[PDB]
Scaffold this active site. Structure first.
Site, short mmCIF file in Angstrom:
data_model
loop_
_atom_site.label_atom_id
_atom_site.label_comp_id
_atom_site.label_asym_id
_atom_site.label_seq_id
_atom_site.Cartn_x
_atom_site.Cartn_y
_atom_site.Cartn_z
N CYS A 58 21.39 39.18 -26.10
CA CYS A 58 21.03 40.56 -26.29
C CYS A 58 22.27 41.35 -26.63
O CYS A 58 23.39 40.91 -26.40
CB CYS A 58 20.38 41.18 -25.06
SG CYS A 58 18.97 42.15 -25.67
N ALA A 59 22.06 42.53 -27.20
CA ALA A 59 23.19 43.37 -27.55
C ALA A 59 23.65 44.08 -26.29
O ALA A 59 23.56 43.53 -25.19
CB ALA A 59 22.77 44.38 -28.61
#
Lengths: 164, 164
Positions: A58-59
């Site tokens: 995920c960012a």
């Protein structure tokens, strides 16, 4: 003029500009139900467009933005991508975020060109180019950006600055 | 006529029958590179078509079939669905099996109708109906099944039978 890790890619369609009105469109929610842009009448909309929100790791800057944006008054953040509802439901960029929803273009690829984010060359062809479009409660473009580099962090601040 | 949990769903296209030859097609592999039916010329093929291989629920029976078919002489198993490549790597029925690859139709929706697995109604519209198609070294159909009930397990034995 858009690139992927430095390599040029062709993006088709007309990218919405400030002052322009975004037409109503229908996408699919995590529960396979149709979700229309007008289903959020009288609300400000933030269209967070990604080639994929199932890239794995995920960012962080991505989640940070969604949170701050969805926390604004009367605003909805719509993360849009061609990922199927099954995969979008796992997107960690808008999980515990109330005003943040993911919608899929899997049965409306026509929308890609309509929003000027239709990647037509390279391995990402058929996916939506990275972009951020802000709309008021009347669907008028308050701000919009077609990121020049896919692997580059959008100008989030500019997007928030217009919402307040 | 195919159904989903009783409620019938419309599936467009001509489903390949025994006595017909399947034409070449191009899909997308996990690395986003194109994969064509012709890339496996002169080999037998098993087209394992799924509405989605990212449902979160993966039966060991799905993986078992792929392994058995792939272990057969000069046979390639192609698991096909509209899930993007990013998700197709989260499938339990392909990872680890030499001659079992997953390919996506996200860039070739026309393939759905071409194989007569194009779901057009209900929440699964835009996805490929559950089916198994076995082709010989000449792409002639040896066995094919359009699963009457999506929530039903395909007749795997019938498919393996024609290959051995």
């Amino acid at each position: 003029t858009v690139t992927l890790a430095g390599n040029p890619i062709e993006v088709g369609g007309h990218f919405p500009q400030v002052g322009e009105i975004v037409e109503n469109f229908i996408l699919v929610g995590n529960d396979l139900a149709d979700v229309a842009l007008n289903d959020f009448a009288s609300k400000r909309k933030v269209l967070n467009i990604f080639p994929s929100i199932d890239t794995g790791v995920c960012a962080t800057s991505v989640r940070k933005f969604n949170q701050q944006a969805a926390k604004l008054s009367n605003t909805i953040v719509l993360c849009i991508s061609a990922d199927l509802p099954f995969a979008q439901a796992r997107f960690c960029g808008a999980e515990g975020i109330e005003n943040a929803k993911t919608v899929s273009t899997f049965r409306n690829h026509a929308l890609h060109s309509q929003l000027g984010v239709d990647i037509q060359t390279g391995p990402l062809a058929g996916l939506t180019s990275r972009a951020v479009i802000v709309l008021d409660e009347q669907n008028n473009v308050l701000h919009s950006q077609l990121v020049e580099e896919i692997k580059e962090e959008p100008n989030y601040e500019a997007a928030l600055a217009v919402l307040a």
